[PDB]
Antibody, heavy 221, light 213 residues
Framework: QVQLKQSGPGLVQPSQSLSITCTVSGFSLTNYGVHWVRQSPGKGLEWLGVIWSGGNTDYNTPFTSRLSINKDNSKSQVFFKMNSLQSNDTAIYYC?????????????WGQGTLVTVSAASTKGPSVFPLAPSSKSTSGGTAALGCLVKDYFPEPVTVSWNSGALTSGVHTFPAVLQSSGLYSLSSVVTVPSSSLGTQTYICNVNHKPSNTKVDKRVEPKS | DILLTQSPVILSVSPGERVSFSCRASQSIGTNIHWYQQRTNGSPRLLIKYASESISGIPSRFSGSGSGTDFTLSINSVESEDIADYYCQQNNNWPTTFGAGTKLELKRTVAAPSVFIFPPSDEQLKSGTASVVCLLNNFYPREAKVQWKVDNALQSGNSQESVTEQDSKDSTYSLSSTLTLSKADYEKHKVYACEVTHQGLSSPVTKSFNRGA
């Protein structure tokens, strides 16, 4: 299996630099180029550059003076670095490999790295329960969740029962509060008959602040 | 740069129908076009290369055609797993460029939301702020309205909402609305209510609670 795996998301200050690592498996960097593409709401997908098999690089015109791509063939890692960042560089950055060593038919993609460019400081979330009620239980189904409040930057990831509970989960898009901090909620609907015995824990991970929080969500007498 | 223009911005189609996506180039690019699917919070997935050439592991219901400046991606018998954004890419001319995407929405029967209201947790109240959450679950179509009432007074300026992307399993949307008050203000009032209007509801649905009951 060809796989590409990227380093975690993070916050960078305007005028400073970002660094992303792409670790590949299932092929050798000595035989394929690795490309970098970014995606932002408002600029679409944008190809950034490539490091070829033999180490030559090509950088797209907007980036020739502030982009550097190098690699470690022996460890199957590609290093993307971009300088002099401004707000409009906030984006999800992807590495990708083409079908053919010389081509641009991107059959394999990393999972993406959300880089936020802003002068603000990182802040981890507070997590509060959204308890299932009794007057709210609708025909053998109950709703419960977690409120993930006051964090910066995006993203947070939410799972339930460490990934064992996926059915009926809705993790909502974050909203930017006037304070400049994000908030989101994650909910799940479950059998009412289960509420007594089955435990429900939301797992919130905020990598920019190295925050990991588990929150047990319980009925109330 | 070659400009790729994708149309329309959103395509709403019924299950089982054939659907076509348009990608037009600002200059002739031969057949040097590739197509991608991107599901919510996922990475692009190569569907078609060089206008019409198939990709290992992609269902036969995906096909592509066209040349020059006028290109089409087609899905025969669309199904729920096809709910996604679709992008074209050209590489006749350096640098390779991408279109801005077409969103595929799958139509379904009208479904009114199931509505749930959540008081602030005692833990949050310890910190001086009170978030009340209203959940509108699994509704269609996407248009829905939430009105917050505190002691039967319509609220304005103190709520924010978020809507999910269309669920690939049941073709519905869900919506979360949060009313934020200071703890002190929260404790000055009794009845908190979320009032919901939606095409599937002939009258508004209200979910409420009395603080402290």
């Amino acid at each position: 299996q060809v796989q590409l795996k990227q380093s975690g998301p993070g916050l960078v200050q305007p005028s400073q630099s970002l660094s992303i690592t792409c670790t590949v498996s299932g092929f050798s960097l000595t035989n394929y180029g690795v490309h970098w593409v970014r995606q932002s709401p408002g600029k679409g997908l944008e190809w950034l550059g490539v490091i070829w098999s033999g180490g030559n690089t090509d950088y797209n015109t907007p980036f020739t003076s502030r982009l550097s791509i190098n690699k470690d063939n022996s460890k199957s890692q590609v290093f993307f670095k971009m300088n002099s960042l401004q707000s409009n560089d906030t984006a999800i950055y992807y590495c990708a490999r083409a079908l053919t060593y010389y081509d641009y038919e991107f059959a394999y993609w990393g999972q993406g790295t959300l880089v936020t460019v802003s002068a603000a400081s990182t802040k981890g979330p507070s997590v509060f329960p959204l308890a299932p009620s009794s007057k709210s239980t609708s025909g053998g189904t109950a709703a419960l969740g977690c409120l993930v409040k006051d964090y910066f930057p995006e993203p947070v990831t939410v799972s339930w029962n460490s990934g064992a509970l996926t059915s009926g989960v809705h993790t909502f898009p974050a909203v930017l509060q006037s304070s400049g901090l994000y908030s989101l909620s994650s909910v799940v609907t479950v059998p009412s008959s289960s509420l007594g015995t089955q435990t429900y824990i939301c797992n919130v991970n905020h990598k920019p602040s190295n925050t990991k929080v588990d929150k047990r969500v319980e009925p109330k007498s | 740069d070659i400009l790729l223009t994708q149309s329309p911005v959103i395509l709403s189609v019924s299950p089982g129908e054939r659907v076509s996506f348009s990608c037009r180039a600002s200059q002739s690019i031969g057949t040097n076009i590739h197509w991608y699917q991107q599901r919510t919070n996922g990475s692009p997935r190569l569907l078609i290369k060089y206008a019409s050439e198939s990709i290992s592991g992609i269902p036969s219901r995906f096909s592509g055609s066209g040349s020059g400046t006028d290109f089409t991606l087609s899905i025969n018998s669309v199904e729920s797993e096809d709910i996604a954004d679709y992008y074209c890419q050209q590489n006749n001319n350096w640098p390779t460029t991408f279109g801005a995407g077409t969103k595929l929405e799958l139509k379904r029967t009208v479904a009114a939301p199931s509505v749930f209201i959540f008081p602030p947790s005692d833990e949050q109240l310890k910190s001086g702020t009170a978030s009340v959450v209203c959940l509108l679950n699994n509704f269609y179509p996407r248009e829905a309205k939430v009105q917050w009432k505190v002691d039967n007074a319509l609220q304005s300026g103190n709520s924010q909402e978020s809507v999910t992307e269309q669920d690939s399993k049941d073709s519905t949307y869900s919506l979360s609305s949060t009313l934020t008050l200071s703890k002190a203000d929260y404790e000055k009032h009794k009845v908190y209510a979320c009032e919901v209007t939606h095409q599937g509801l002939s009258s508004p649905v209200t979910k409420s609670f009395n603080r402290g009951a």
